Each structure stands twice: as C-alpha cells, then as structure tokens.
Design a protein around this motif. Structure first.
Motif, PDB file in Angstrom:
ATOM      1  N   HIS A 153      -9.488  -0.895   3.513  1.00 27.84           N
ATOM      2  CA  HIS A 153      -8.851   0.200   2.791  1.00 27.84           C
ATOM      3  C   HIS A 153      -8.704   1.391   3.727  1.00 27.84           C
ATOM      4  CE1 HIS A 153     -11.507  -2.097   0.102  1.00 27.84           C
ATOM      5  NE2 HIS A 153     -10.675  -1.858  -0.894  1.00 27.84           N
TER       6      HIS A 153
ATOM      7  N   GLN B  73       1.742   2.873  -2.661  1.00 31.03           N
ATOM      8  CA  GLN B  73       1.271   3.684  -3.798  1.00 31.03           C
ATOM      9  C   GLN B  73      -0.209   3.365  -4.047  1.00 31.03           C
ATOM     10  OE1 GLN B  73       4.782   2.254  -6.407  1.00 31.03           O
ATOM     11  NE2 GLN B  73       4.217   4.270  -7.198  1.00 31.03           N
ATOM     12  N   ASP B  74      -0.929   4.178  -4.844  1.00 32.11           N
ATOM     13  CA  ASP B  74      -2.355   3.931  -5.167  1.00 32.11           C
ATOM     14  C   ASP B  74      -2.520   2.785  -6.186  1.00 32.11           C
ATOM     15  OD1 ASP B  74      -3.605   5.827  -3.491  1.00 32.11           O
ATOM     16  OD2 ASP B  74      -3.740   7.369  -5.010  1.00 32.11           O
TER      17      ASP B  74
ATOM     18  N   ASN C 162      -7.904   5.706   4.231  1.00 32.93           N
ATOM     19  CA  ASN C 162      -8.046   6.994   3.598  1.00 32.93           C
ATOM     20  C   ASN C 162      -6.687   7.635   3.410  1.00 32.93           C
ATOM     21  OD1 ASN C 162      -8.693   9.680   2.969  1.00 32.93           O
ATOM     22  ND2 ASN C 162     -10.564   9.597   4.258  1.00 32.93           N
ATOM     23  N   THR C 163      -6.296   7.884   2.167  1.00 30.65           N
ATOM     24  CA  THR C 163      -4.932   8.344   1.906  1.00 30.65           C
ATOM     25  C   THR C 163      -4.654   9.731   2.475  1.00 30.65           C
ATOM     26  OG1 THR C 163      -5.457   9.116  -0.330  1.00 30.65           O
ATOM     27  CG2 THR C 163      -4.673   6.822  -0.122  1.00 30.65           C
ATOM     28  N   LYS C 164      -5.685  10.501   2.804  1.00 30.46           N
ATOM     29  CA  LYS C 164      -5.438  11.809   3.405  1.00 30.46           C
ATOM     30  C   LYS C 164      -4.718  11.697   4.752  1.00 30.46           C
ATOM     31  CE  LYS C 164      -8.925  14.374   4.968  1.00 30.46           C
ATOM     32  NZ  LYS C 164     -10.291  14.997   4.954  1.00 30.46           N
TER      33      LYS C 164
ATOM     34  N   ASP D 292       0.835  -1.204   0.000  1.00 29.70           N
ATOM     35  CA  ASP D 292       0.000   0.000   0.000  1.00 29.70           C
ATOM     36  C   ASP D 292       0.870   1.254   0.000  1.00 29.70           C
ATOM     37  OD1 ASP D 292       0.999  -0.131   2.563  1.00 29.70           O
ATOM     38  OD2 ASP D 292      -0.893   0.456   3.549  1.00 29.70           O
TER      39      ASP D 292
ATOM     40  N   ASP E  78      -0.944   7.023   6.509  1.00 23.61           N
ATOM     41  CA  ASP E  78      -0.756   5.587   6.685  1.00 23.61           C
ATOM     42  C   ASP E  78      -1.893   4.991   7.507  1.00 23.61           C
ATOM     43  OD1 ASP E  78      -0.133   6.015   9.377  1.00 23.61           O
ATOM     44  OD2 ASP E  78       1.999   5.647   9.139  1.00 23.61           O
TER      45      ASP E  78
ATOM     46  N   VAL F 267      -7.390   0.656  -5.162  1.00 27.37           N
ATOM     47  CA  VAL F 267      -8.121   1.647  -4.403  1.00 27.37           C
ATOM     48  C   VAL F 267      -9.631   1.503  -4.567  1.00 27.37           C
ATOM     49  CG1 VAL F 267      -6.213   3.337  -4.604  1.00 27.37           C
ATOM     50  CG2 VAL F 267      -8.122   3.418  -6.189  1.00 27.37           C
TER      51      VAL F 267
ATOM     52  N   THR G 210      -9.785   8.977  -1.657  1.00 27.42           N
ATOM     53  CA  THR G 210      -9.242   7.727  -2.149  1.00 27.42           C
ATOM     54  C   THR G 210      -8.851   6.863  -0.972  1.00 27.42           C
ATOM     55  OG1 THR G 210      -8.376   8.767  -4.155  1.00 27.42           O
ATOM     56  CG2 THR G 210      -7.308   6.664  -3.473  1.00 27.42           C
ATOM     57  N   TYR G 211      -9.288   5.607  -1.013  1.00 25.11           N
ATOM     58  CA  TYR G 211      -8.969   4.663   0.048  1.00 25.11           C
ATOM     59  C   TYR G 211      -8.163   3.496  -0.539  1.00 25.11           C
ATOM     60  CZ  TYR G 211     -12.372   6.863   3.242  1.00 25.11           C
ATOM     61  OH  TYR G 211     -13.089   7.692   4.050  1.00 25.11           O
ATOM     62  N   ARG G 212      -7.000   3.221   0.042  1.00 26.31           N
ATOM     63  CA  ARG G 212      -6.056   2.235  -0.485  1.00 26.31           C
ATOM     64  C   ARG G 212      -6.222   0.884   0.185  1.00 26.31           C
ATOM     65  NH1 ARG G 212      -0.184   4.987  -0.506  1.00 26.31           N
ATOM     66  NH2 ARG G 212      -0.920   6.522  -2.068  1.00 26.31           N
TER      67      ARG G 212
END
Ligand SMILES: Oc1ccc(SSc2ccc(O)cc2O)c(O)c1
Ligand SMILES: OSc1ccc(O)cc1O
Ligand SMILES: [Zn+2]
Length: 257
Positions: free
Chosen positions: A119, A71-72, A121-123, A69, A126, A75, A84-86
């Motif tokens: 997944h 990188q995207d 939240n990329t905001k 995880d 980590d 998702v 965006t959720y990874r």
C-alpha cells in the motif's frame, strides 16, 4: 540482473544496491520476547470492500496481483500509520520445501511462504513518489503455513498456469483480497525496506501474528512457476526470499499482549 541463484542472489545485491547494507533493511527476525506491546498504537483498519483487481503478472521474481489505485477503493489505515495507504498490489515469497520460504521469521521460525499486501501513502500522490519517502509504503505481511486449504487463495492458484514464465500476464478481475486474511489482525510493526532490489527504505512493516493455512497442493502450484522467460532454460521459481537482516537501531512493537 539480480535474482535468487548462487551467482546473483541476496549476497550479491549490495554491489548494485549498496542500501542492501543500510540501517533499516528487511526482512528481520521478530524476537517475540523483546518486541514490546505499545498501548499507543491505534486499531488497524483494513478496508478492502471496494477493491478492484486488474491483472496478474509474472515479473521473473514473483507474481503480482495488480489493483486499480486511482481512487481510495482498498485502503489500510490505523495501527502505526498516519493517514491513508492505498492497495496497489500483492505478491508472495515462498520456498522449495515447506520448512522455508518466508522472509520475516518469528523466533527464528521460517514459514512456508509470506504474502505482502503493498500500500502507498496517498499524501505522496502516486507509488513512484511514495517509494522515495521514509513513510511512503505500508506492507501488510502474512505468513503461510501448510495445512488446510485456503479457499480465498484458490482463484490465484488456478490462474498460475497461464503466467508460467517471466513477462506473462493475464486478466485477474473481481478478486477479493479479504479472502487472504487470517481471523486476527494482531501484529508486529517496525520500519524497514523492500525485500527485493531496489531495497528502498520506505516501508512501515505490519506483520500479522496469525498465519493463514494453505494446502500442500496450493503451495506446490506456486513452485511450478518459472523465473525464466518462455524459450529459455527452465528454472523453477522457488526460494524467492531474502534472509533476515540486522535489526540495528530498531525496535519492533507489538499491538497485543
Ligand atoms: O497505478 C498503478 C501502477 C502500476 C500497477 S501494477 S502493480 C505493481 C506496483 C508496484 C510494483 O513495483 C510492481 C507492480 O506490479 C498498478 O496496479 C497500479
Ligand atoms: O516485499 S518485497 C516488496 C517488493 C515490491 C514492493 O512494492 C513492495 C514489497 O514489500
Ligand atoms: Zn515482498
């Protein structure tokens, strides 16, 4: 030392994890006759084409298939989600018998098992930071019923003999999680929690309406796993599910009429 036995199971968890009695606990029963269709929901987007699986681990509670995880690559977006959720991992919860095992229920129906695709939240940068936020995780929940075999599950089934006991891991590269999805992405969504300790209230749940079918032989292989470590008394890893919790002041929304 939490678990799923009489002495350390779901009825005991609140003593170490008081959030177990919190306002947004999971799983819940999904009453299909009170969930409301929400035309505001945007289409759900599952983008798993570049997923990079790494390893599979028996953690003593379930087994996790773990992804890169950094990188995207895989998702989840859209639906109720902002941003965006990874994908970081998936796991299952399952029963000792085909008539139980799921965590969510649908009009009180229990399925044989439930897949959780997790997944973050990329905001929040980590996973560890994301679980401290009310919108930190999105978990895609998919019910399993026993019927026809699911070809996309078989690679998972076939590695389980190599991770029988707690703490064992194995290589698990080049697995495509698209093979675990049903045809339809119709879903219910509500705000909730992890269904295992630490029971953090950080999850937007997206539970698919359509179950996947897996064969009796496939689920039987899940039931041969062990909760214990090697060289300890054997206790089969079965009934690793939490029962439904109070809905409290929440509404379940449907993506479909
Ligand atoms: O950045 C990464 C960090 C860890 C992992 S392991 S999956 C994993 C994630 C969350 C868990 O509570 C348990 C797990 O087994 C990973 O795949 C990526
Ligand atoms: O569903 S139980 C559960 C456990 C770990 C996790 O990262 C996410 C989960 O939803
Ligand atoms: Zn889970």
């Amino acid at each position: 030392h939490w678990g799923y036995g009489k002495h350390n199971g779901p009825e005991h968890w609140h003593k170490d994890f008081p959030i177990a009695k919190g306002e947004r606990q999971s799983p819940v029963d999904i009453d299909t006759h009170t969930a409301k269709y929400d035309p505001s929901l945007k289409p759900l987007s599952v983008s798993y084409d570049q997923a990079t699986s790494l390893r599979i681990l028996n953690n003593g509670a379930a087994f996790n298939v773990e992804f890169d995880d950094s990188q995207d690559k895989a998702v989840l977006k859209g639906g109720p989600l902002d941003g965006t959720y990874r994908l970081i991992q998936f796991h299952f919860h399952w029963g000792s018998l085909d008539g139980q095992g799921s965590e969510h229920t649908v009009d009180k129906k229990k399925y044989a098992a439930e897949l959780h695709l997790v997944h973050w939240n990329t905001k929040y940068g980590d996973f560890g930071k994301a679980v401290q936020q009310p919108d930190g995780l999105a978990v895609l929940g998919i019910f399993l019923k026993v019927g026809s075999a699911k070809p996309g599950l078989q690679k998972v089934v076939d590695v389980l003999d190599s991770i029988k006991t707690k703490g064992k891991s194995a290589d698990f590269t080049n697995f495509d999680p698209r093979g675990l999805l049903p045809e339809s992405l119709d879903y219910w969504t509500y705000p909730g929690s992890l269904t295992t300790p630490p029971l953090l209230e950080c999850v937007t749940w997206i539970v698919l309406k359509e179950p996947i079918s897996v064969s009796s032989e496939q689920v039987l292989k899940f039931r041969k796993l062990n909760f214990n470590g090697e060289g300890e008394p054997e206790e089969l890893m079965v009934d690793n599910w939490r029962p439904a919790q109070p809905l409290k002041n929440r509404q379940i929304k449907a993506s479909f009429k």
